[PDB]
Amino acid sequence: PWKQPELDPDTPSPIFGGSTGGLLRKAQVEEFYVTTWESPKEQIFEMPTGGAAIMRKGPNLLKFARKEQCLALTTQLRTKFKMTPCFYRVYADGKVEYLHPKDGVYPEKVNAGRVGVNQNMRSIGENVDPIKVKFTGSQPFTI
Amino acid sequence: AHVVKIYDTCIGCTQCVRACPLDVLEMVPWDGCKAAQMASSPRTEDCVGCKRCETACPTDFLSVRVYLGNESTRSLGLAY
Amino acid sequence: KKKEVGPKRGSLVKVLRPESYWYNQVGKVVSVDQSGIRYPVVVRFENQNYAGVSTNNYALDEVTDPPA
Amino acid sequence: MKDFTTYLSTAPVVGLGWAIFTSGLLIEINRFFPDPLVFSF
Amino acid sequence: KVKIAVDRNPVETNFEKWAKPGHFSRALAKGPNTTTWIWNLHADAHDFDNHTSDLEEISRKVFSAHFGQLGIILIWLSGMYFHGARFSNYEGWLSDP
Amino acid sequence: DVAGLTPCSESKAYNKLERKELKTLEKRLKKYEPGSAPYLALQATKERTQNRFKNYAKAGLLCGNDGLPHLISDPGLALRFNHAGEVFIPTFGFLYVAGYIGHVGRQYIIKSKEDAKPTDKEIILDVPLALQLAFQGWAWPLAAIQELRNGSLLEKDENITVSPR
Numbered sequence: 001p002w003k004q005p006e007l008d009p010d011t012p013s014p015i016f017g018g019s020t021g022g023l024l025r026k027a028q029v030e031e032f033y034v035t036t037w038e039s040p041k042e043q044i045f046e047m048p049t050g051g052a053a054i055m056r057k058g059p060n061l062l063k064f065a066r067k068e069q070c071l072a073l074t075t076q077l078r079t080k081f082k083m084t085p086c087f088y089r090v091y092a093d094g095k096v097e098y099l100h101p102k103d104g105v106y107p108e109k110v111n112a113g114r115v116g117v118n119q120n121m122r123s124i125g126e127n128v129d130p131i132k133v134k135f136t137g138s139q140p141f142t143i
Numbered sequence: 144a145h146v147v148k149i150y151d152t153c154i155g156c157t158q159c160v161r162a163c164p165l166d167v168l169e170m171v172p173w174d175g176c177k178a179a180q181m182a183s184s185p186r187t188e189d190c191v192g193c194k195r196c197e198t199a200c201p202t203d204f205l206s207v208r209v210y211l212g213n214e215s216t217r218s219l220g221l222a223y
Numbered sequence: 224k225k226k227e228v229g230p231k232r233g234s235l236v237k238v239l240r241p242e243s244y245w246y247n248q249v250g251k252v253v254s255v256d257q258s259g260i261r262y263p264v265v266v267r268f269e270n271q272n273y274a275g276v277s278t279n280n281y282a283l284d285e286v287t288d289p290p291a
Numbered sequence: 292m293k294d295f296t297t298y299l300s301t302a303p304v305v306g307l308g309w310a311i312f313t314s315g316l317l318i319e320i321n322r323f324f325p326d327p328l329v330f331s332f
Numbered sequence: 333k334v335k336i337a338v339d340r341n342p343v344e345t346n347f348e349k350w351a352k353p354g355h356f357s358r359a360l361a362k363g364p365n366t367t368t369w370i371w372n373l374h375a376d377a378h379d380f381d382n383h384t385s386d387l388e389e390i391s392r393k394v395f396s397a398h399f400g401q402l403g404i405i406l407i408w409l410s411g412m413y414f415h416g417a418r419f420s421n422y423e424g425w426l427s428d429p
Numbered sequence: 430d431v432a433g434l435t436p437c438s439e440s441k442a443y444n445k446l447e448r449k450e451l452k453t454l455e456k457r458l459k460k461y462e463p464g465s466a467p468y469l470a471l472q473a474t475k476e477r478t479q480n481r482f483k484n485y486a487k488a489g490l491l492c493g494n495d496g497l498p499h500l501i502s503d504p505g506l507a508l509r510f511n512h513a514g515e516v517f518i519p520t521f522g523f524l525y526v527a528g529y530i531g532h533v534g535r536q537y538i539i540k541s542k543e544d545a546k547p548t549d550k551e552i553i554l555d556v557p558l559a560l561q562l563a564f565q566g567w568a569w570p571l572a573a574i575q576e577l578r579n580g581s582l583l584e585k586d587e588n589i590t591v592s593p594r
């Protein structure tokens with residue numbers, strides 16, 4: 001966005017008991033994802049890693065082992081309460097990377113700031129045959 | 144990681160991004176369509192290959208294409 | 224611009240795009256974009272594809288009059 | 292009546308009617324011509 | 333507190349919906365365009381939770397479907413008793429079972 | 430006497446099979462009183478078996494080493510040895526009926542594709558039109574070859590959907 005928010009580990013977690021689909025050994029060895037949002041009131045939601053939790057009125061922080069769980073929680077909060085959350089990725093060494101709102105306006109919008117990458121300027125079906133690209137390491141769709 | 148390729152037949156309907164369960168696609172400004180939008184894949188290393196973007200594509204054939212290969216921890220959808 | 228960039232609106236056209244589902248099929252012109260986009264001709268078909276859609280965008284060179 | 296007639300005009304109803312007609316024709320042919328194998332008169 | 337709550341004549345007994353096969357759902361209300369539609373017509377036929385979001389109409393449909401299944405079961409039982417009455421040797425079996 | 434097959438009338442194993450079937454039918458028949466419905470049913474079955482065994486004979490049928498009749502297949506060989514009605518004429522009749530069905534279906538498809546929403550006519554049949562085409566298909570081969578002659582039977586490949594190469 002205008003200024004990228006920084007992850008605060010001291011923000012309170014939502015009211016929830018024990019978890020079984022939560023963090024495995026990958027969290028302490030590889031990266032794990034952390035979703036934060038700002039609940040205006042006390043309400044009950046459903047986590048993608050198990051049953052139901054209650055989010056606190058204020059900042060809420062949750063931890064997941066997969067980015068798909070973070071985006072599932074993000075779209076559940078956006079469709080149900082229009083929450084606009086955001087999740088970071090934390091590596092084993094503590095590096096924090098901002099993932100979902102890269103320009104802060106969500107990928108449904110445009111913002112006229114992003115650069116289109118991995119785009120082919122030809123129509124699909126105009127790609128060359130696999131015989132044309134052989135023993136070269138380049139796929140017909142990568143050119 | 145998998146390869147996500149987007150062609151000029153896209154109409155900028157933003158349906159592939161909404162159907163994406165891992166935030167791989169994005170919309171960038173463009174001039175080749177009426178909606179002045181074009182799909183991009185700046186986070187293709189997080190794609191698993193679920194082909195949900197291809198299901199939401201309204202154009203004939205596919206304006207977005209997912210090619211599998213070179214599976215990683217993120218591409219295999221592993222929580223461990 | 225003089226006349227129009229594409230065919231007459233509402234006229235039947237034949238799709239020459241080989242990768243399209245409606246190759247060698249007849250559709251109806253809904254609208255042709257005058258801005259100058261890559262695929263301005265909007266064609267609607269009576270028979271839907273496997274995705275369930277019935278409208279598509281095509282360029283000028285992949286649409287012709289249906290043979291009789 | 293015309294709603295009922297269009298209901299009978301649906302594909303499963305006319306299929307059932309055709310199946311009943313064909314089965315009855317073949318069964319009455321086989322009953323009145325017991326065990327036909329060789330086309331002779 | 334517990335009492336009979338009944339609405340009088342909510343659905344008209346007409347054959348206008350028998351002509352159109354796909355009528356319970358909005359997806360099949362537009363008519364067929366592919367053959368899978370036919371299968372869909374025979375798949376979501378009794379999925380009353382998908383046709384409407386109102387629990388009262390679903391409960392009424394469940395009640396009437398249960399009545400229809402009971403009528404089917406009673407027809408089958410009457411057919412069993414009729415087959416025992418005419419095309420059977422039950423009286424002969426009673427002498428030496 | 431073609432293909433090393435004896436005729437059913439002059440065969441030996443054919444008579445053995447006939448006597449065996451009559452013997453088991455009589456063994457089943459002897460367990461009932463003559464004035465009973467199962468007796469009448471078994472007598473009718475025995476009469477039908479005798480009539481079938483008689484009608485399979487005196488018709489050119491051939492059987493080899495087992496009494497079970499064999500069907501001569503090659504036309505010409507079947508034509509010159511009184512076996513045309515075994516398979517040569519039944520396939521002619523089947524071709525007539527199959528062409529009837531195909532021509533009636535083709536006529537219904539063509540006449541139903543003219544109006545708006547042809548899928549509704551496909552899934553809700555026009556019964557008077559179907560019955561009219563049902564009684565108008567008695568001359569299906571003449572009509573089929575004439576549409577072949579005028580080219581309306583075939584569609585040009587430019588108008589037919591073609592899979593990409």
Ligand code: CLA
Pocket residue numbers: 301302303306307310350352353370373374552
């Ligand atoms: C009572 C329960 C019941 C049952 C068992 C069926 C069974 C069937 N219906 Mg359905 N149907 C029902 C209630 C039921 N229906 C109701 C309540 C409605 C709303 C009015 C419909 C409306 C409906 C439509 C609109 C259509 C069916 C069709 C079909 C068939 C599925 C497609 C098929 O066979 O492959 C495809 C089969 C073929 C391409 C073969 C075509 C030629 C066959 C040999 C002629 C049909 C003869 C038939 C099989 C025998 C009589 C039916 C049998 C149940 C006694 C199948 C025979 C479809 C159909 O007619 O297919 C036969 C179809 O289009 N049904």
Ligand code: CLA
Pocket residue numbers: 316320321325326327328526
């Ligand atoms: C696909 C393989 C096949 C073939 C070639 C046959 C062929 C035959 N089987 Mg077999 N059968 C089959 C599969 C097959 N069957 C299967 C799958 C089963 C298990 C269900 C059976 C079970 C079976 C039994 C149990 C018996 C046979 C019998 C027969 C004979 C029937 C002949 C007949 O009815 O007279 C000829 C009939 C006709 C020509 C019908 C007339 C139709 C034409 C179009 C005229 C239409 C009528 C009318 C004039 C139209 C105008 C009026 C209309 C507008 C209303 C024939 C040899 C019977 C037999 O005799 O064996 C030797 C027998 O006992 N089969």
Ligand code: CLA
Pocket residue numbers: 374375376377378379380381
């Ligand atoms: C108390 C009994 C009962 C009741 C009221 C229901 C009610 C329902 N079930 Mg359930 N179900 C039941 C028992 C029951 N089911 C049992 C015992 C099983 C285990 C097999 C299932 C498995 C089951 C599944 C897996 C699904 C349902 C679904 C459904 C819904 C729609 C069903 C439908 O439209 O079918 C329409 C009717 C048909 C499709 C016809 C079925 C015919 C079968 C497949 C073949 C017939 C076999 C026959 C005996 C042999 C024929 C031979 C041939 C030669 C004629 C509805 C809520 C579906 C749903 O969407 O739920 C929300 C769903 O996905 N049910």
Ligand code: CLA
Pocket residue numbers: 516519520521523524526527528530531532534
């Ligand atoms: C009891 C008798 C019996 C039964 C039940 C069947 C059943 C069947 N036959 Mg068979 N057949 C039989 C006897 C029988 N046959 C006999 C005695 C012969 C002569 C030896 C044949 C010769 C025959 C052929 C040559 C073909 C069949 C086909 C078929 C199947 C589909 C028919 C169809 O599409 O609907 C009715 C037909 C239509 C809806 C479309 C019309 C298409 C027909 C076949 C064309 C007829 C006109 C054509 C120009 C004549 C030249 C034929 C060409 C092969 C040279 C069906 C399973 C067909 C099949 O299995 O295809 C996969 C097929 O091609 N049959």
Ligand code: CLA
Pocket residue numbers: 530531532533534535537554559562
């Ligand atoms: C009457 C319509 C009709 C006609 C003219 C044809 C004609 C043809 N079909 Mg098709 N077919 C049909 C219906 C029809 N089919 C249906 C309903 C099905 C779904 C079961 C198929 C499935 C089918 C397959 C899977 C294949 C063909 C093939 C063929 C070709 C071989 C000839 C043949 O008999 O195949 C045999 C055809 C069958 C066995 C299908 C019979 C299906 C039912 C029994 C007939 C339906 C009759 C219809 C209800 C009549 C409507 C009349 C109207 C007044 C209501 C030929 C171009 C073959 C091909 O490509 O050859 C080049 C092939 O592989 N067909």
